[PDB]
Structure formats: structure tokens, C-alpha cells
């Protein structure tokens, strides 16, 4: 019976999401994701930023980004090293911008940062003590990606 | 053809759930399971004893609970701080149950516990060296998850 | 409906199937895998190499094998402790193969080794600093599986 075999592959196909939503749901808590908080990973490799923001995206999130103090925190624990952050003053000199839209509100910038520096200095990276500092986007740096909550 | 192409969709979801059933492995494994061995995993989150039931639920696990020494001694090296078993005498103080069902097989208390201490205490905790101590099931402990062997 | 129904599952399985594409990304990038390298994975666990050559291919991996300096060293960082190598002589005495298949192309032997020692010696392990030496398959060592750059 036709009908039936298709009612069938619909309860499977339906199976099948929910095991799979269970599996993503099991890797994030395993990646320390707490309940309600979006949260963070890396491989520990370090990359240009368009590397890192490419990469993110591949993987449907986005450049870590620190929206106040707590989440600096767990970024700075899951890096364990400089890496970039999801904000660039990319698109008008000054004006730090989170990559996925809006001005720059909670910030951690070391004493004298941002300093664009030399011919310029247009990322962000968290390094010592989670203080951030403005970099080259092409410098390499630890790629963390951070997932929706 | 409808019949032809139904087949072939049948055998492409099966070989799907073969491949998630492989990711789940995978997973468990680079996770620490051990082979024959219940796999323990916690995202390092202190909560409510309600809370970790839910969580470990949603997962569609249940909370840690040590059999044996072993087993103990696994769940100890996941949660590396305080965490709640799945073990409580709330529906009768005094006789701990397995939140799954059944009477405590093994138990490695503390010296002085259980003593549902004040206002009663009826959630166990496996605290410093693997012991355990009864406490209030409103206090915060570390989330630990069990998944089949 | 008929028809309408099956061509909608045929998209449902082909987004099933880019999911869990995503899902293996996302976690191979948990695990550490660089970029076009490819990655060792460990759970820890001691066991004899039959163990572990059964283990990685139920993984769909290989035993863990160096094919340079670089590899060499990698493979030490994840197992922390002495991991048998994807490398034996078992087929024939004195004749270093891979597991999967070829003379060795790379080696890091430490001096008078491969020595087939007393009973004898058949499998090969990366010891605590890069140096290889050949020992017993029946050994319980370290299980590192490998994937695909
Ligand atoms: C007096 O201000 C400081 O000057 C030094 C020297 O010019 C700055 O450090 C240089 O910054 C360059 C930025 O592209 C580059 O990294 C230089 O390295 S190298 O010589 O090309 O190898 C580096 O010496 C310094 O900038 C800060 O520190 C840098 C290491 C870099 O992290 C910058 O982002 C920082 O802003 C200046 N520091 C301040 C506080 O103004
Ligand atoms: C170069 C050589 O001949 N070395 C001998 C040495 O073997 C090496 O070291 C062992 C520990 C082992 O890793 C071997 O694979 C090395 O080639 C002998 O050591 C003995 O080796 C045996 C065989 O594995 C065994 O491990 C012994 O330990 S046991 O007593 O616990 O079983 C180990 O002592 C050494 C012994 O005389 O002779 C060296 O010439
Ligand atoms: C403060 C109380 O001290 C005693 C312990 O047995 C209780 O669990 C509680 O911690
Ligand atoms: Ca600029
Ligand atoms: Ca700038
Ligand atoms: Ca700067
Ligand atoms: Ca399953
Ligand atoms: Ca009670
Ligand atoms: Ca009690
Ligand atoms: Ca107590
Ligand atoms: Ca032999
Ligand atoms: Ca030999
Ligand atoms: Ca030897
Ligand atoms: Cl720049
Ligand atoms: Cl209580
Ligand atoms: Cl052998």
C-alpha cells in the first residue's frame, strides 16, 4: 500500500528531526552551553578574521561576541588565547560595529585601545585578562564561534 | 516509478539513520565514553536538583547515578566539582530511591550521612573524593547527565 | 497528494541530510579539526590493538597514523599517554605496514628499535615524547582514531 509506505516515511523523516535535534541539543550542553546562554567554541586554530567570520558561518553562527561581562568571561575561558571578536570598525573609522548589525555597547578595551594603529587597525581581539584590543583583521588569530541560545 | 522512487527514499532514510546513530558515537566517544560504559557528561552548570531532572530529561538522559565504585569514580571525573545523583528520599525520608526507580544497591556516603540536616535534606550530592552528602534538593549543584552503555 | 507528498519528502531528506553534514562540521570543529588537516580523536581508554582497530572502524576512522614530524607530534598531544599506531609487522615479521595498507613512508624509531622484544613485539606505539617503539598488541594502550583531512 502505497498511502501506508507514506505515512510511514512521514513518521520516519519526523523521527529522524527529533533525533537529530537530541543530538544537537546533547553536543551543546557537552560544549558547556548553559541553559538559556548561547555559547562558545573553537578548534584553537588561528586565521585571518574573514577566515574566522567565514568559517562561523559555515557552521550557522557567528564571531563570538562579548555582550557583557559574563560572556567576556567565557570567551576568554574557551580561546585561551587572543582571538578575534564578531565587532569591526570596518565600515566607518571609529565606530565599532557587532558583525551581525548594531553600534557597539558593552566594551572591555585595554588602557589606551582602541588605538587604530599605524596604517590602521579595523578588528577586535580579546587577549590578557579578556581586555580587548584592535588589531589588524589580518592578523591570525584564535577562531571562537559563538551559537544562538 | 512512485513505487521505485518511494524504495530508493526509504533506503536513502535509512542509510541516514545510520549516519546519525554514527555521529552519536562519535560523539560519546571523543566525549570519554568508555567502551560497555555509561556514558557521563555534564555542561559544568550548577542548578537546582528540578532543574538538572528537566535538563538531563530533555536530553533524554537521566541523572548520573553510580551503580558501583566505577561508576562513581566516572561521575566524579566528569562533574570535578559538587553534583547532584539521581537519588532522593523525598517521597520518604530515610529510604533513598533511585530517581528511575528502586532502593539504593550502592551508596558511598560521607562520614555523618546521611543526617538530613534542618529543614530535611533529600537530594544527594557527590561531593570532594567521590563521597556523598544528603542535601536541600534547592541548592545549586553541577549537571550530570547519563546516557546507555 | 500522492505525488505532492513523496516530492516533499524527497526535499525534506536532502535537508536532513545537509543538517547532519553541518552537525558532523560543527563537531568535528568542537574537536579540534584545523582546516584541510586531519584529526586524531581519543576517549582515553586503554585497550589491545584489535580493540582499537575494531573501535575507529565501527567510528568509520583508522588507528592513528604519522605520516610526518608534524602528525607525529599532533597524535602525541591528543592521546596524553602511550597510544598504539595504525603500524604493524604483524603479516610479516621485520615488515612495518600500515593498517591500512603500504610500507612506511615516515618513522620516528627510537635507537635499537624495532626490536621485536622476548615473546616478541608486533604493534607500535607513539611513547610520552614522539619517539616510536614496538611492543605487544595484546598490550592495553591508549585509542586514538583518525579522520579524514
Ligand atoms: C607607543 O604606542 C605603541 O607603539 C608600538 C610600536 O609602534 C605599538 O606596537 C606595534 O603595533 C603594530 C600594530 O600593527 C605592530 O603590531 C607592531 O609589531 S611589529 O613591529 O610590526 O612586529 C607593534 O610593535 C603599540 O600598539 C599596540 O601593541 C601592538 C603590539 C598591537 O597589539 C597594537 O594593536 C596595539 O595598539 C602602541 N601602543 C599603544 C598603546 O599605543
Ligand atoms: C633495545 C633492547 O633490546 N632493549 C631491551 C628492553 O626492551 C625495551 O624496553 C622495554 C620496556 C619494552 O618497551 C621493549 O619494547 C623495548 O624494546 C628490555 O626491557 C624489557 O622488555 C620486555 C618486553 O617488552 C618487558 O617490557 C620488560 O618488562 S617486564 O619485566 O615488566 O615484562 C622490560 O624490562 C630489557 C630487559 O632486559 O632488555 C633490553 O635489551
Ligand atoms: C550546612 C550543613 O552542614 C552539615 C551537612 O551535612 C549538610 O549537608 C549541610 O551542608
Ligand atoms: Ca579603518
Ligand atoms: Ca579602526
Ligand atoms: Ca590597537
Ligand atoms: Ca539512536
Ligand atoms: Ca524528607
Ligand atoms: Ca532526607
Ligand atoms: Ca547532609
Ligand atoms: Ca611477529
Ligand atoms: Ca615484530
Ligand atoms: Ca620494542
Ligand atoms: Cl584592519
Ligand atoms: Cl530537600
Ligand atoms: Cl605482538
Known amino acids: 500500500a ?3 509506505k507514506l505515512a510511514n516515511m512521514e513518521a520516519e523523516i519526523n523521527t529522524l528531526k527529533s533525533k537529530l535535534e537530541l543530538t544537537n541539543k546533547l553536543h551543546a550542553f557537552s560544549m558547556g552551553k548553559k541553559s538559556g546562554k548561547k555559547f562558545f567554541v573553537t578548534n584553537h586554530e588561528r586565521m585571518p578574521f574573514s577566515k574566522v567570520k ?5 557552521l ?10 559574563e ?9 585561551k588565547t587572543s582571538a578575534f571578536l564578531g565587532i569591526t570598525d570596518e565600515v566607518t573609522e571609529g565606530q565599532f560595529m557587532y558583525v551581525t548589525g548594531g553600534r557597539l555597547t558593552y566594551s572591555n578595551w585595554k588602557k589606551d585601545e582602541p ?5 590602521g587597525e579595523d578588528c577586535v581581539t580579546i587577549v590578557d585578562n579578556g581586555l ?14 559563538e551559537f544562538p541560545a
Chains 1, 2, 3 share one sequence.
Open 2 to 4: 502505497i498511502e501506508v
Open 54 to 58: 567565514a568559517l562561523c558561518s559555515e
Open 60 to 69: 550557522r553562527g557567528t564571531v563570538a561576541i562579548p555582550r557583557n561581562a
Open 71 to 79: 560572556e567576556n568571561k567565557a570567551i576568554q575561558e574557551v580561546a
Open 115 to 119: 588605538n587604530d594603529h599605524g596604517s
Open 132 to 145: 580587548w584590543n584592535d588589531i589588524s583583521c589580518q592578523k591570525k588569530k584564535t577562531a571562537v564561534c
